[PDB]
């Protein structure tokens, strides 16, 4: 019955393809799964839940983090159960993962939003500075990234909607408005010094 791994790898494969994940990721996921499985460390749970958590871990270990929401999307399991398994697995395998950062999502988010490299860089910059100046303490890095992207895009010709960004980043627009409100007071100090302001820093949305 342990060769139920095959069914796990199939499921892993399925999920991975729904979001076109490179092979290194799927391989890592399979290894993680095999290791946890053979260890019999997480008794009483559902294999697909474990597999989905393994997937989530793999993306982070391979340096390109997916949010739990994203892994949830391609999975039959809930965020809550994936999260529970996630923590349980790190402990069983005596592993860890680097804390997530705003930068970890800047690339993919901006791509999905079809934003020009120039904006992507501005956002990335705004987020990093914002955190450095401790403007958004306690906020999720995903939230801060979403707000930075919003700020950036609104200062560019390629403007984006709180709703648009929120759908791609997987955060509610009020969540965006909250972080945005916190970074807005320092907008001038947050953009890259040589930035082409389609909309002047002032005329920026005053949520």
């Amino acid at each position: 019955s342990d060769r139920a791994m095959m069914n796990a790898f199939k499921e892993i494969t399925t999920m991975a393809d729904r979001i076109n994940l490179p092979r290194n990721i799927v391989d890592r996921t399979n290894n993680l799964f095999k290791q946890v499985y053979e260890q019999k460390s997480l008794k009483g749970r559902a294999n697909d839940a474990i597999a989905s958590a393994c997937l989530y871990i793999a993306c982070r270990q391979e340096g390109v983090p997916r949010t739990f929401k994203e892994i949830c999307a391609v999975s039959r399991i809930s965020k809550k159960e994936i999260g529970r398994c996630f923590k349980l697995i790190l402990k069983a395998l005596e592993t860890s993962v680097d804390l997530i950062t705003t930068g970890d999502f800047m690339s993919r988010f901006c791509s999905n939003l079809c934003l020009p490299k120039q904006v992507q860089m501005a956002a990335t910059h705004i987020a990093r500075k914002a955190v450095e100046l401790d403007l958004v303490p306690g906020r999720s890095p995903i939230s801060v990234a979403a707000a930075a992207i919003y700020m950036a895009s609104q200062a560019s010709a390629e403007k984006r909607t709180q709703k648009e960004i929120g759908d791609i980043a997987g955060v509610a627009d009020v969540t965006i408005r909250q972080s945005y409100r916190l970074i807005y007071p320092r907008a001038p100090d947050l953009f890259p010094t040589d930035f082409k302001f389609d909309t002047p820093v002032d005329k920026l949305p005053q949520l």
């Binding site: 949010t67 999260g83 860890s96 997530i100 401790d134 303490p137 306690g138 906020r139 999720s140």
Partner: protein
Amino acid sequence: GSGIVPQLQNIVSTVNLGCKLDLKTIALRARNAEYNPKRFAAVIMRIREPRTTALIFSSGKMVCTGAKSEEQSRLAARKYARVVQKLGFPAKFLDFKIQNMVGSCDVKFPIRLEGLVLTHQQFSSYEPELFPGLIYRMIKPRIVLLIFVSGKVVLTGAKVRAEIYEAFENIYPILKGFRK
């Protein structure tokens, strides 16, 4: 010394009344009772002093929740046992025991969770997408702490008051080393 004493916020204790009970009658006769077996298998009762809430099971065992001290939890526990007694049941008060204690306090300065999770990964879990606070599972004493960037700290899992105090003393130095 931290010079800070964590404040007890909640105590959970159990006691055995010894005799089997009939929730329906209790629920009916008792004033501040409540019983919906469809919803939950026990009677929920509440006294205002000690401000508490109890869970009474037909087995005769009950759970006392809400007290801010061991003394107060036991006092309330007895008052509960009394109303049951007074409604005509061979109620005793066997094996009263504190099962969990919760404490909380403020180290008074912001904390760099990012840093703490870096050097303490072994005991930490800090995932912003899952919970805004860092979850610290201390081994000695076996207490779990919830640490927030604001400097507020919650401690739980204690069987005795000392465990709460000890865990906070153990964590204070660590936290100080991560002050913003």
